[PDB]
Design a protein around this motif. Sequence first.
Motif, short mmCIF file in Angstrom:
data_model
loop_
_atom_site.label_atom_id
_atom_site.label_comp_id
_atom_site.label_asym_id
_atom_site.label_seq_id
_atom_site.Cartn_x
_atom_site.Cartn_y
_atom_site.Cartn_z
N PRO A 1 0.82 -1.22 0.00
CA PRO A 1 0.00 0.00 0.00
C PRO A 1 0.85 1.27 0.00
O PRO A 1 0.63 2.18 -0.80
N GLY A 2 1.83 1.32 0.90
CA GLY A 2 2.69 2.48 0.99
C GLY A 2 2.22 3.48 2.02
O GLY A 2 1.95 3.13 3.16
N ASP A 3 2.12 4.74 1.61
CA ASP A 3 1.67 5.80 2.51
C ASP A 3 0.24 5.57 2.96
O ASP A 3 -0.08 5.69 4.14
N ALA A 4 -0.63 5.23 2.01
CA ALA A 4 -2.03 4.97 2.31
C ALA A 4 -2.19 4.25 3.64
O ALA A 4 -2.88 4.73 4.54
N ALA A 5 -1.53 3.10 3.77
CA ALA A 5 -1.60 2.32 5.00
C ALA A 5 -0.74 2.94 6.09
O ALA A 5 -1.18 3.07 7.24
N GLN A 6 0.48 3.32 5.74
CA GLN A 6 1.40 3.93 6.69
C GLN A 6 0.67 4.89 7.62
O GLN A 6 0.70 4.74 8.84
N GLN A 7 0.00 5.88 7.03
CA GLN A 7 -0.75 6.87 7.81
C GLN A 7 -1.40 6.22 9.02
O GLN A 7 -1.41 6.79 10.11
N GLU A 8 -1.94 5.02 8.83
CA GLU A 8 -2.60 4.30 9.92
C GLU A 8 -1.57 3.75 10.90
O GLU A 8 -1.66 4.00 12.11
N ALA A 9 -0.60 3.01 10.39
CA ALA A 9 0.44 2.42 11.22
C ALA A 9 1.11 3.49 12.09
O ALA A 9 1.22 3.33 13.31
N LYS A 10 1.55 4.57 11.46
CA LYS A 10 2.20 5.66 12.18
C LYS A 10 1.29 6.22 13.26
O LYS A 10 1.76 6.78 14.25
N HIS A 11 -0.02 6.08 13.06
CA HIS A 11 -1.00 6.57 14.02
C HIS A 11 -0.95 5.76 15.31
O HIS A 11 -0.91 6.32 16.41
N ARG A 12 -0.94 4.44 15.18
CA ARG A 12 -0.90 3.55 16.33
C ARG A 12 0.38 3.77 17.13
O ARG A 12 0.37 3.74 18.37
N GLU A 13 1.49 3.98 16.43
CA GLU A 13 2.78 4.19 17.08
C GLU A 13 2.72 5.40 18.00
O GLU A 13 3.56 5.56 18.89
N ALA A 14 1.73 6.26 17.79
CA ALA A 14 1.56 7.46 18.61
C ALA A 14 0.62 7.20 19.78
O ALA A 14 0.65 7.90 20.78
N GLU A 15 -0.23 6.18 19.63
CA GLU A 15 -1.19 5.83 20.67
C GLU A 15 -0.52 5.00 21.76
O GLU A 15 -0.74 5.23 22.95
N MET A 16 0.29 4.03 21.35
CA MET A 16 0.98 3.16 22.29
C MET A 16 1.98 3.96 23.13
O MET A 16 2.03 3.82 24.35
N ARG A 17 2.78 4.79 22.46
CA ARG A 17 3.78 5.60 23.14
C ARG A 17 3.13 6.45 24.23
O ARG A 17 3.63 6.53 25.35
N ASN A 18 2.01 7.09 23.90
CA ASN A 18 1.30 7.93 24.84
C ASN A 18 1.04 7.19 26.15
O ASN A 18 1.46 7.63 27.22
N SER A 19 0.35 6.05 26.05
CA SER A 19 0.04 5.25 27.23
C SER A 19 1.31 4.86 27.98
O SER A 19 1.28 4.61 29.18
N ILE A 20 2.42 4.81 27.25
CA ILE A 20 3.70 4.45 27.85
C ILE A 20 4.30 5.63 28.60
O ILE A 20 4.94 5.46 29.64
N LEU A 21 4.10 6.83 28.07
CA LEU A 21 4.62 8.04 28.70
C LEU A 21 3.72 8.50 29.84
O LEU A 21 4.19 9.06 30.83
#
Length: 118
Positions: free
Chosen positions: A23-43
């Motif tokens: 997919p490329g960016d299309a999907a990435q946008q989503e993946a990169k989103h989760r990486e921001a949700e998990m980190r938050n709960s971690i911080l």
Amino acid sequence: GSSGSSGLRRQRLAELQAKHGDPGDAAQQEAKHREAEMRNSILAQVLDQSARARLSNLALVKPEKTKAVENYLIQMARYGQLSEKVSEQGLIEILKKVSQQTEKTTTVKFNRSGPSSG
């Protein structure tokens, strides 16, 4: 905010799903989103409501500096350096810790979760 599903803790392993092409960016946008949700709960878990206010406050005047610190706390969690919720005093000291220790844009290449038809 989680629209629809939240996150099940399914207990079952299964081979990955190799999807033809990419997919490329299309999907990435989503993946990169989760990486921001998990980190938050971690911080938010490693940083008490107190330390939080302190950090953010700095992120304003020094966004780049504080930024690096954010990653430090995260990596520290996984490893096992952070014993209990850090407090203002502690955090403040951290700021003058990540700088002393060299650091750069370090990325990790591995397989975490495979995509699926949806």
